[PDB]
Amino acid sequence: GITVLTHSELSAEIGVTDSIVVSSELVMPYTVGTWLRGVAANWSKYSWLSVRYTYIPSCPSSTAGSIHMGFQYDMADTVPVSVNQLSNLRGYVSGQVWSGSAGLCFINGTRCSDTSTAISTTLDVSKLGKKWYPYKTSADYATAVGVDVNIATPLVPARLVIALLDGSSSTAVAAGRIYCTYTIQMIEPTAS
Amino acid sequence: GGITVLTHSELSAEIGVTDSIVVSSELVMPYTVGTWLRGVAANWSKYSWLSVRYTYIPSCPSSTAGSIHMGFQYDMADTVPVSVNQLSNLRGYVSGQVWSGSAGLCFINGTRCSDTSTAISTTLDVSKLGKKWYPYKTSADYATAVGVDVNIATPLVPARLVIALLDGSSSTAVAAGRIYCTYTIQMIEPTA
Amino acid sequence: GGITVLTHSELSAEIGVTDSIVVSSELVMPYTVGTWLRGVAANWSKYSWLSVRYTYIPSCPSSTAGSIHMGFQYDMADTVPVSVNQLSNLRGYVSGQVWSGSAGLCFINGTRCSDTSTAISTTLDVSKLGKKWYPYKTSADYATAVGVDVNIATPLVPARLVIALLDGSSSTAVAAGRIYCTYTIQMIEPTA
Amino acid sequence: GGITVLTHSELSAEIGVTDSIVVSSELVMPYTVGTWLRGVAANWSKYSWLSVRYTYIPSCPSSTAGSIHMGFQYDMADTVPVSVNQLSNLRGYVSGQVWSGSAGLCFINGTRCSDTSTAISTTLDVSKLGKKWYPYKTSADYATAVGVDVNIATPLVPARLVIALLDGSSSTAVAAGRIYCTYTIQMIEPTA
Amino acid sequence: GGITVLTHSELSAEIGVTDSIVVSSELVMPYTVGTWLRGVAANWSKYSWLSVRYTYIPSCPSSTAGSIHMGFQYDMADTVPVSVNQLSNLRGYVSGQVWSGSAGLCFINGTRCSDTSTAISTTLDVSKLGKKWYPYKTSADYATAVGVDVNIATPLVPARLVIALLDGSSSTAVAAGRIYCTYTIQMIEPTA
Amino acid sequence: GGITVLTHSELSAEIGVTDSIVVSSELVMPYTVGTWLRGVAANWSKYSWLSVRYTYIPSCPSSTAGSIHMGFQYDMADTVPVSVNQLSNLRGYVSGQVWSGSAGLCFINGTRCSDTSTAISTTLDVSKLGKKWYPYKTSADYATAVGVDVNIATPLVPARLVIALLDGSSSTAVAAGRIYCTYTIQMIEPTAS
């Protein structure tokens, strides 16, 4: 009954200022990329076999700024406010806003070799609360958080946390992009 | 160990057919599969489905107009389907004339099954349930849970059985058949 | 040594359907399974069932409304069922259209059984009886015993077959089918 | 690799019979096989059929007059059959009563198949198709293409299902049954 | 198979000691061993004891005067013993100070048993019971049966537990301890 | 891996006995098991019980009247037991004189256990839990969940330990013993402040 899918797609566009800005993304089909959102909507349940977020730069080597990424696995956790907090998360990675080219081989599934510089991070699928998660939307998450933030824990596997700081401007400078490379097991079709 | 393993078949539903579609459902949990199991499994806090099978057996003339449809939904938030087409997409979907289904009898009395291609019988994906050990809950417990949020109910009930009947010759329900449930349940952790 | 073993099939019951439920029963003992065995087995004092199977054979048109239900009770004090729901819980419960059951014929003449999924046929738990050697007793002996105490009768009769017929179209019984008994009996200790 | 392999069954056609021959057809391509798959495969550019099976399931009384016939055309330029005689020569031609075919159900839920000699079910010669990777096209794409040249359409649709209904007792269509499609499709090269 | 096998421990009797001998008893049958098993086993018609152990666990100071005595009778017609002398001859006879007996605890939670020599714990000779499959009976059923003839009861209950308390220092009952029942029961032949 | 494994014993409850049944309970989750683990496990977002044991060790004279009873509830919605009869049915039910239990000590310092039949000690069914990885939750977060719906708590807490004391000689609490908890916990995925 399992339809297995592997794909890479644009997941976020990224900019840096001279002050820390913390953003986040739900690690679930609805919010991982527009393409997967449409596809997985045809199923009621899924399971992450693999989730990877990779930052690819698009700026000069001369751009001031850095990007930081990590995972939270409990929705009730407050989003970090400092790089110091963030550095403790599983899969914390960090790099100059112009590093990360070396992550490119993950996205198109090529022979990965000199990936020491890759600003890439992967989900501990092995340690999620459960295996089969329901496909839920942002709307479903939001309302759920209103009743209890913990009702959300059985709906979403993790949250991706992102920080950008060390930039030279108060204004967003075009920095890079975050892509997601995932292998998803999609099961139990639905006509809604 | 503490696991009391039970295998049993009992009456689960009475079925009648009309000239327009009538869609019913049953939560796939001890309280609602059959009156006997309801009383037995109440003496424990938790259960685990090792096997659950719903079988339609006819009681009508071969000249009876009508068909029966059954399938499973595994997300309590799913709307119960409104057309056979929707229904046709569900896991374990089966369909037949309301006067068909006799060969499903061998499942019910646990005998050697051979010619079961005509059986209007379907089985629960125990392998794909959210967790293994579910709480014994009542219909009251479920209604209350969804009264707050439908997604609260998902860790409470493993699945729901969907039934649609249509294609009948009368606007008044004609007696068609019965659905039996044949289950193998693990019961653990008693209560007084 | 001293055991005479007999295997035989004979008519055990004639069956008709009404539109309202009728529950009948038969003691599973030589005296009441069939007239031939009654006379034969009376020549010995005690007996033991090695195998007992009751099989329904239809004799009605495919357009006949009605269904038949059969199951065993193994305690003479057990109250006879009043609903299908109840009956469905007994060991060896079987159920089908009043015009189904043809596939059971092969059990009666002891030939190679293949497609028996459709068979409205059921068998006694020889391994689960009170004792092995039962006294040959009459309905008269039984009637008397339960008159004194119903529990006195239990070591006298190995089981009772319960039958319900309903879902018919008439207020007057329509000829539906017949129940045959296929048994293997051990007869010991002759008597004059 | 890039291949998402998907296996599914869904409603493809509802079927009614009259007393004069009525011939219809269906393109064997994701867009026209079923509404669910139509939406799903739309997220990919090209596909390959590994298996497509069309199964008719009855929903009528056994006393229903009428018969259904199915076959495949593999050249889009072939003119639609007009008689049972023509239709009978097609690859995978099948034929039966409009109330027969229950035995095909095991194909639809993918269960253990035993007695399927009576199944009104037929399958595509995937091995003999014009090419392997076909483009996702709509009814619109097919329609316009044949407007320029019908031969342009052959690389666009892998095959056509031909359906005939006749032998009925009424001049008004009687509800007879349904055709389900069970397919295994290889989908490649995502598009936004 | 049809056998639902159950193992459980539960409270069966609360025990008090006086300065004169007080002889009580308990029927070793599902209804009277404990309130939990009573409810549970009621759902089946017959049972079999695989193992029954009665274990006294103390709750009084080490300075509490008194002794406890337990043994089994296997014939309902036996008069209940009147002196410790008689009681000492019964199968499974055990005896100890009313504040002794803690080491029996490992039997109750089914853990690794080591130093159990001081355990005031005793077990039923299941191999020597009259029969294997016993009917679930009430205290009421027993009462009426001996009302007719005491020996009618013998095939109804497998054995009797006999208890004597004496050597206490008070004329009024002192809280001494509790008797727990630890059983493995085979339950067969469901009933509604 | 990311798994920090810890094996430890600490005081979990002080126990006193009266002449009337007094039923108390404890959440089997790091925060409420002991003062030490609470602070330690808080540095992780999630945990897993590999083993949990509650052992009652006595501190009273051999002449102290009273008995203690312990068992597990694994469903948060279950009403707490009110009688020894009910409690006796629970998984891992143990029972004894309030002055018995000396033999459980070996479980606590992890030494060679021998004659432990008299031990008033009981263990969690880790295999039978709803899930494996539970979030670290506080009492407050727990209380809040049941205010909305008690069933929300079940994915938050793996189990509850139920405790009964009765059969005493005083109407006011007499010092009887202490309950220690011996656990092996898997702690994963740190969190800061």
mmCIF file with all atom_site columns, N, CA and C in Angstrom, chain B residues 27 29-32 38 41-42 44-47 76 134-158 191, chain F residues 75-79 148-152 154:
data_model
loop_
_atom_site.group_PDB
_atom_site.id
_atom_site.type_symbol
_atom_site.label_atom_id
_atom_site.label_alt_id
_atom_site.label_comp_id
_atom_site.label_asym_id
_atom_site.label_entity_id
_atom_site.label_seq_id
_atom_site.pdbx_PDB_ins_code
_atom_site.Cartn_x
_atom_site.Cartn_y
_atom_site.Cartn_z
_atom_site.occupancy
_atom_site.B_iso_or_equiv
_atom_site.pdbx_formal_charge
_atom_site.auth_seq_id
_atom_site.auth_comp_id
_atom_site.auth_asym_id
_atom_site.auth_atom_id
_atom_site.pdbx_PDB_model_num
ATOM 1   N N  . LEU B 1 27  ? -16.562 2.743  14.234 1.00 0.00 ? 27  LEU B N  1
ATOM 2   C CA . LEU B 1 27  ? -15.210 2.912  14.709 1.00 0.00 ? 27  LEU B CA 1
ATOM 3   C C  . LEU B 1 27  ? -14.657 1.518  14.940 1.00 0.00 ? 27  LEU B C  1
ATOM 4   N N  . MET B 1 29  ? -12.893 -0.263 17.039 1.00 0.00 ? 29  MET B N  1
ATOM 5   C CA . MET B 1 29  ? -12.419 -0.402 18.412 1.00 0.00 ? 29  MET B CA 1
ATOM 6   C C  . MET B 1 29  ? -13.405 -1.279 19.189 1.00 0.00 ? 29  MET B C  1
ATOM 7   N N  . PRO B 1 30  ? -12.916 -2.022 20.204 1.00 0.00 ? 30  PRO B N  1
ATOM 8   C CA . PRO B 1 30  ? -13.687 -3.046 20.926 1.00 0.00 ? 30  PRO B CA 1
ATOM 9   C C  . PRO B 1 30  ? -15.094 -2.617 21.305 1.00 0.00 ? 30  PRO B C  1
ATOM 10  N N  . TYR B 1 31  ? -15.243 -1.388 21.787 1.00 0.00 ? 31  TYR B N  1
ATOM 11  C CA . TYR B 1 31  ? -16.534 -0.908 22.249 1.00 0.00 ? 31  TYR B CA 1
ATOM 12  C C  . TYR B 1 31  ? -17.598 -1.006 21.167 1.00 0.00 ? 31  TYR B C  1
ATOM 13  N N  . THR B 1 32  ? -17.188 -0.811 19.921 1.00 0.00 ? 32  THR B N  1
ATOM 14  C CA . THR B 1 32  ? -18.161 -0.678 18.855 1.00 0.00 ? 32  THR B CA 1
ATOM 15  C C  . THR B 1 32  ? -18.158 -1.782 17.808 1.00 0.00 ? 32  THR B C  1
ATOM 16  N N  . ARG B 1 38  ? -17.303 -5.906 23.541 1.00 0.00 ? 38  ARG B N  1
ATOM 17  C CA . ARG B 1 38  ? -17.451 -4.680 24.318 1.00 0.00 ? 38  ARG B CA 1
ATOM 18  C C  . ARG B 1 38  ? -17.382 -5.001 25.805 1.00 0.00 ? 38  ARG B C  1
ATOM 19  N N  . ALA B 1 41  ? -13.505 -6.853 26.644 1.00 0.00 ? 41  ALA B N  1
ATOM 20  C CA . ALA B 1 41  ? -12.306 -6.003 26.577 1.00 0.00 ? 41  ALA B CA 1
ATOM 21  C C  . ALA B 1 41  ? -12.354 -4.819 27.571 1.00 0.00 ? 41  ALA B C  1
ATOM 22  N N  . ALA B 1 42  ? -13.539 -4.545 28.112 1.00 0.00 ? 42  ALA B N  1
ATOM 23  C CA . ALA B 1 42  ? -13.700 -3.479 29.092 1.00 0.00 ? 42  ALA B CA 1
ATOM 24  C C  . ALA B 1 42  ? -12.935 -3.773 30.371 1.00 0.00 ? 42  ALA B C  1
ATOM 25  N N  . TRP B 1 44  ? -9.986  -4.704 30.537 1.00 0.00 ? 44  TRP B N  1
ATOM 26  C CA . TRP B 1 44  ? -8.597  -4.292 30.330 1.00 0.00 ? 44  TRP B CA 1
ATOM 27  C C  . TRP B 1 44  ? -8.485  -2.810 29.927 1.00 0.00 ? 44  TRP B C  1
ATOM 28  N N  . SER B 1 45  ? -7.314  -2.211 30.101 1.00 0.00 ? 45  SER B N  1
ATOM 29  C CA . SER B 1 45  ? -7.141  -0.791 29.786 1.00 0.00 ? 45  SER B CA 1
ATOM 30  C C  . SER B 1 45  ? -6.740  -0.594 28.323 1.00 0.00 ? 45  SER B C  1
ATOM 31  N N  . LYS B 1 46  ? -5.926  -1.520 27.838 1.00 0.00 ? 46  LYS B N  1
ATOM 32  C CA . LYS B 1 46  ? -5.376  -1.411 26.510 1.00 0.00 ? 46  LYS B CA 1
ATOM 33  C C  . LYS B 1 46  ? -5.605  -2.673 25.687 1.00 0.00 ? 46  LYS B C  1
ATOM 34  N N  . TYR B 1 47  ? -5.521  -2.503 24.382 1.00 0.00 ? 47  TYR B N  1
ATOM 35  C CA . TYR B 1 47  ? -5.609  -3.620 23.474 1.00 0.00 ? 47  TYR B CA 1
ATOM 36  C C  . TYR B 1 47  ? -4.679  -3.396 22.307 1.00 0.00 ? 47  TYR B C  1
ATOM 37  N N  . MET B 1 76  ? -9.074  9.960  11.687 1.00 0.00 ? 76  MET B N  1
ATOM 38  C CA . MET B 1 76  ? -10.404 10.300 12.176 1.00 0.00 ? 76  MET B CA 1
ATOM 39  C C  . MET B 1 76  ? -10.892 11.629 11.586 1.00 0.00 ? 76  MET B C  1
ATOM 40  N N  . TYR B 1 134 ? -3.500  0.698  21.940 1.00 0.00 ? 134 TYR B N  1
ATOM 41  C CA . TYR B 1 134 ? -4.583  1.679  22.034 1.00 0.00 ? 134 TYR B CA 1
ATOM 42  C C  . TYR B 1 134 ? -5.381  1.505  23.330 1.00 0.00 ? 134 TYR B C  1
ATOM 43  N N  . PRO B 1 135 ? -5.918  2.612  23.869 1.00 0.00 ? 135 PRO B N  1
ATOM 44  C CA . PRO B 1 135 ? -6.812  2.578  25.026 1.00 0.00 ? 135 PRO B CA 1
ATOM 45  C C  . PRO B 1 135 ? -8.226  2.096  24.690 1.00 0.00 ? 135 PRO B C  1
ATOM 46  N N  . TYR B 1 136 ? -8.829  1.351  25.616 1.00 0.00 ? 136 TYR B N  1
ATOM 47  C CA . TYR B 1 136 ? -10.238 1.015  25.512 1.00 0.00 ? 136 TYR B CA 1
ATOM 48  C C  . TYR B 1 136 ? -11.000 2.328  25.696 1.00 0.00 ? 136 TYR B C  1
ATOM 49  N N  . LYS B 1 137 ? -11.822 2.692  24.735 1.00 0.00 ? 137 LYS B N  1
ATOM 50  C CA . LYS B 1 137 ? -12.585 3.912  24.853 1.00 0.00 ? 137 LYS B CA 1
ATOM 51  C C  . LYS B 1 137 ? -14.035 3.612  24.504 1.00 0.00 ? 137 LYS B C  1
ATOM 52  N N  . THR B 1 138 ? -14.963 4.407  25.029 1.00 0.00 ? 138 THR B N  1
ATOM 53  C CA . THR B 1 138 ? -16.364 4.279  24.648 1.00 0.00 ? 138 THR B CA 1
ATOM 54  C C  . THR B 1 138 ? -16.717 5.298  23.568 1.00 0.00 ? 138 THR B C  1
ATOM 55  N N  . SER B 1 139 ? -17.926 5.170  23.018 1.00 0.00 ? 139 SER B N  1
ATOM 56  C CA . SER B 1 139 ? -18.453 6.115  22.040 1.00 0.00 ? 139 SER B CA 1
ATOM 57  C C  . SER B 1 139 ? -18.527 7.510  22.636 1.00 0.00 ? 139 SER B C  1
ATOM 58  N N  . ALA B 1 140 ? -18.911 7.553  23.909 1.00 0.00 ? 140 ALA B N  1
ATOM 59  C CA . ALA B 1 140 ? -18.918 8.764  24.708 1.00 0.00 ? 140 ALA B CA 1
ATOM 60  C C  . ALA B 1 140 ? -17.519 9.363  24.774 1.00 0.00 ? 140 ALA B C  1
ATOM 61  N N  . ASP B 1 141 ? -16.525 8.528  25.075 1.00 0.00 ? 141 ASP B N  1
ATOM 62  C CA . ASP B 1 141 ? -15.156 9.018  25.157 1.00 0.00 ? 141 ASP B CA 1
ATOM 63  C C  . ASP B 1 141 ? -14.724 9.639  23.831 1.00 0.00 ? 141 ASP B C  1
ATOM 64  N N  . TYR B 1 142 ? -15.048 8.976  22.730 1.00 0.00 ? 142 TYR B N  1
ATOM 65  C CA . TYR B 1 142 ? -14.712 9.461  21.393 1.00 0.00 ? 142 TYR B CA 1
ATOM 66  C C  . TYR B 1 142 ? -15.390 10.792 21.000 1.00 0.00 ? 142 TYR B C  1
ATOM 67  N N  . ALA B 1 143 ? -16.703 10.895 21.229 1.00 0.00 ? 143 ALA B N  1
ATOM 68  C CA . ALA B 1 143 ? -17.498 12.099 20.929 1.00 0.00 ? 143 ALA B CA 1
ATOM 69  C C  . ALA B 1 143 ? -16.935 13.316 21.679 1.00 0.00 ? 143 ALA B C  1
ATOM 70  N N  . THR B 1 144 ? -16.654 13.106 22.957 1.00 0.00 ? 144 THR B N  1
ATOM 71  C CA . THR B 1 144 ? -16.084 14.134 23.782 1.00 0.00 ? 144 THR B CA 1
ATOM 72  C C  . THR B 1 144 ? -14.745 14.569 23.213 1.00 0.00 ? 144 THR B C  1
ATOM 73  N N  . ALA B 1 145 ? -13.918 13.598 22.855 1.00 0.00 ? 145 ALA B N  1
ATOM 74  C CA . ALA B 1 145 ? -12.600 13.918 22.353 1.00 0.00 ? 145 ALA B CA 1
ATOM 75  C C  . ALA B 1 145 ? -12.684 14.772 21.088 1.00 0.00 ? 145 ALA B C  1
ATOM 76  N N  . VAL B 1 146 ? -13.559 14.398 20.144 1.00 0.00 ? 146 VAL B N  1
ATOM 77  C CA . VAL B 1 146 ? -13.739 15.163 18.892 1.00 0.00 ? 146 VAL B CA 1
ATOM 78  C C  . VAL B 1 146 ? -14.528 16.456 19.130 1.00 0.00 ? 146 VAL B C  1
ATOM 79  N N  . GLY B 1 147 ? -15.269 16.500 20.237 1.00 0.00 ? 147 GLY B N  1
ATOM 80  C CA . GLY B 1 147 ? -15.966 17.709 20.622 1.00 0.00 ? 147 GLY B CA 1
ATOM 81  C C  . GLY B 1 147 ? -14.962 18.822 20.885 1.00 0.00 ? 147 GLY B C  1
ATOM 82  N N  . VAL B 1 148 ? -13.788 18.461 21.397 1.00 0.00 ? 148 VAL B N  1
ATOM 83  C CA . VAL B 1 148 ? -12.687 19.406 21.596 1.00 0.00 ? 148 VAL B CA 1
ATOM 84  C C  . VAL B 1 148 ? -11.840 19.605 20.328 1.00 0.00 ? 148 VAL B C  1
ATOM 85  N N  . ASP B 1 149 ? -11.422 18.496 19.721 1.00 0.00 ? 149 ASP B N  1
ATOM 86  C CA . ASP B 1 149 ? -10.630 18.489 18.489 1.00 0.00 ? 149 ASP B CA 1
ATOM 87  C C  . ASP B 1 149 ? -10.602 17.079 17.883 1.00 0.00 ? 149 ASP B C  1
ATOM 88  N N  . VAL B 1 150 ? -10.969 16.955 16.602 1.00 0.00 ? 150 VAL B N  1
ATOM 89  C CA . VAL B 1 150 ? -11.042 15.651 15.928 1.00 0.00 ? 150 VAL B CA 1
ATOM 90  C C  . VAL B 1 150 ? -9.704  14.896 15.962 1.00 0.00 ? 150 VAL B C  1
ATOM 91  N N  . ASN B 1 151 ? -8.618  15.655 16.021 1.00 0.00 ? 151 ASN B N  1
ATOM 92  C CA . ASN B 1 151 ? -7.273  15.102 16.020 1.00 0.00 ? 151 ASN B CA 1
ATOM 93  C C  . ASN B 1 151 ? -6.873  14.514 17.383 1.00 0.00 ? 151 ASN B C  1
ATOM 94  N N  . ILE B 1 152 ? -7.625  14.853 18.424 1.00 0.00 ? 152 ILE B N  1
ATOM 95  C CA . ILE B 1 152 ? -7.459  14.184 19.710 1.00 0.00 ? 152 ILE B CA 1
ATOM 96  C C  . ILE B 1 152 ? -7.874  12.710 19.625 1.00 0.00 ? 152 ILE B C  1
ATOM 97  N N  . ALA B 1 153 ? -8.855  12.425 18.771 1.00 0.00 ? 153 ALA B N  1
ATOM 98  C CA . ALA B 1 153 ? -9.442  11.092 18.656 1.00 0.00 ? 153 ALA B CA 1
ATOM 99  C C  . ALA B 1 153 ? -8.518  10.117 17.947 1.00 0.00 ? 153 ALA B C  1
ATOM 100 N N  . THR B 1 154 ? -7.625  10.626 17.094 1.00 0.00 ? 154 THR B N  1
ATOM 101 C CA . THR B 1 154 ? -6.726  9.763  16.318 1.00 0.00 ? 154 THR B CA 1
ATOM 102 C C  . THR B 1 154 ? -5.824  8.851  17.166 1.00 0.00 ? 154 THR B C  1
ATOM 103 N N  . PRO B 1 155 ? -5.242  9.359  18.278 1.00 0.00 ? 155 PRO B N  1
ATOM 104 C CA . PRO B 1 155 ? -4.521  8.377  19.104 1.00 0.00 ? 155 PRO B CA 1
ATOM 105 C C  . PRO B 1 155 ? -5.445  7.493  19.942 1.00 0.00 ? 155 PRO B C  1
ATOM 106 N N  . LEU B 1 156 ? -6.761  7.637  19.780 1.00 0.00 ? 156 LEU B N  1
ATOM 107 C CA . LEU B 1 156 ? -7.737  6.889  20.579 1.00 0.00 ? 156 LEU B CA 1
ATOM 108 C C  . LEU B 1 156 ? -8.375  5.715  19.845 1.00 0.00 ? 156 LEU B C  1
ATOM 109 N N  . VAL B 1 157 ? -8.580  5.868  18.546 1.00 0.00 ? 157 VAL B N  1
ATOM 110 C CA . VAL B 1 157 ? -9.189  4.809  17.769 1.00 0.00 ? 157 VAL B CA 1
ATOM 111 C C  . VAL B 1 157 ? -8.279  4.518  16.601 1.00 0.00 ? 157 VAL B C  1
ATOM 112 N N  . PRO B 1 158 ? -8.021  3.233  16.340 1.00 0.00 ? 158 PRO B N  1
ATOM 113 C CA . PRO B 1 158 ? -7.103  2.825  15.264 1.00 0.00 ? 158 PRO B CA 1
ATOM 114 C C  . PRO B 1 158 ? -7.591  3.111  13.828 1.00 0.00 ? 158 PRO B C  1
ATOM 115 N N  . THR B 1 191 ? -8.314  -3.653 34.771 1.00 0.00 ? 191 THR B N  1
ATOM 116 C CA . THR B 1 191 ? -8.855  -2.619 35.657 1.00 0.00 ? 191 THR B CA 1
ATOM 117 C C  . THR B 1 191 ? -10.067 -3.149 36.385 1.00 0.00 ? 191 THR B C  1
ATOM 118 N N  . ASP F 2 75  ? -2.955  4.119  31.526 1.00 0.00 ? 75  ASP F N  1
ATOM 119 C CA . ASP F 2 75  ? -3.903  4.988  30.820 1.00 0.00 ? 75  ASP F CA 1
ATOM 120 C C  . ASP F 2 75  ? -4.265  6.162  31.692 1.00 0.00 ? 75  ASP F C  1
ATOM 121 N N  . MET F 2 76  ? -3.953  7.362  31.238 1.00 0.00 ? 76  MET F N  1
ATOM 122 C CA . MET F 2 76  ? -4.124  8.504  32.114 1.00 0.00 ? 76  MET F CA 1
ATOM 123 C C  . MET F 2 76  ? -5.566  8.777  32.543 1.00 0.00 ? 76  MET F C  1
ATOM 124 N N  . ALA F 2 77  ? -6.523  8.331  31.744 1.00 0.00 ? 77  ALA F N  1
ATOM 125 C CA . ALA F 2 77  ? -7.928  8.610  32.019 1.00 0.00 ? 77  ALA F CA 1
ATOM 126 C C  . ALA F 2 77  ? -8.553  7.718  33.081 1.00 0.00 ? 77  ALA F C  1
ATOM 127 N N  . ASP F 2 78  ? -7.928  6.573  33.355 1.00 0.00 ? 78  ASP F N  1
ATOM 128 C CA . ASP F 2 78  ? -8.405  5.661  34.391 1.00 0.00 ? 78  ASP F CA 1
ATOM 129 C C  . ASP F 2 78  ? -8.532  6.415  35.693 1.00 0.00 ? 78  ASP F C  1
ATOM 130 N N  . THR F 2 79  ? -9.629  6.200  36.424 1.00 0.00 ? 79  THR F N  1
ATOM 131 C CA . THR F 2 79  ? -9.776  6.795  37.757 1.00 0.00 ? 79  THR F CA 1
ATOM 132 C C  . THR F 2 79  ? -8.851  6.044  38.714 1.00 0.00 ? 79  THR F C  1
ATOM 133 N N  . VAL F 2 148 ? -7.990  20.542 29.587 1.00 0.00 ? 148 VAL F N  1
ATOM 134 C CA . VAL F 2 148 ? -8.594  20.578 28.281 1.00 0.00 ? 148 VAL F CA 1
ATOM 135 C C  . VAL F 2 148 ? -9.257  19.237 27.999 1.00 0.00 ? 148 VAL F C  1
ATOM 136 N N  . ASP F 2 149 ? -8.472  18.170 28.133 1.00 0.00 ? 149 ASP F N  1
ATOM 137 C CA . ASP F 2 149 ? -8.942  16.795 27.960 1.00 0.00 ? 149 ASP F CA 1
ATOM 138 C C  . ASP F 2 149 ? -7.890  15.816 28.462 1.00 0.00 ? 149 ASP F C  1
ATOM 139 N N  . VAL F 2 150 ? -8.292  14.948 29.384 1.00 0.00 ? 150 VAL F N  1
ATOM 140 C CA . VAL F 2 150 ? -7.371  14.016 30.019 1.00 0.00 ? 150 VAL F CA 1
ATOM 141 C C  . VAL F 2 150 ? -6.632  13.114 29.013 1.00 0.00 ? 150 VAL F C  1
ATOM 142 N N  . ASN F 2 151 ? -7.238  12.895 27.851 1.00 0.00 ? 151 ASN F N  1
ATOM 143 C CA . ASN F 2 151 ? -6.674  11.969 26.885 1.00 0.00 ? 151 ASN F CA 1
ATOM 144 C C  . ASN F 2 151 ? -5.462  12.560 26.198 1.00 0.00 ? 151 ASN F C  1
ATOM 145 N N  . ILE F 2 152 ? -5.364  13.889 26.239 1.00 0.00 ? 152 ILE F N  1
ATOM 146 C CA . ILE F 2 152 ? -4.195  14.603 25.729 1.00 0.00 ? 152 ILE F CA 1
ATOM 147 C C  . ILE F 2 152 ? -2.955  14.239 26.551 1.00 0.00 ? 152 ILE F C  1
ATOM 148 N N  . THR F 2 154 ? -2.170  11.317 27.773 1.00 0.00 ? 154 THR F N  1
ATOM 149 C CA . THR F 2 154 ? -1.615  9.983  27.499 1.00 0.00 ? 154 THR F CA 1
ATOM 150 C C  . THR F 2 154 ? -0.375  9.962  26.581 1.00 0.00 ? 154 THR F C  1
#
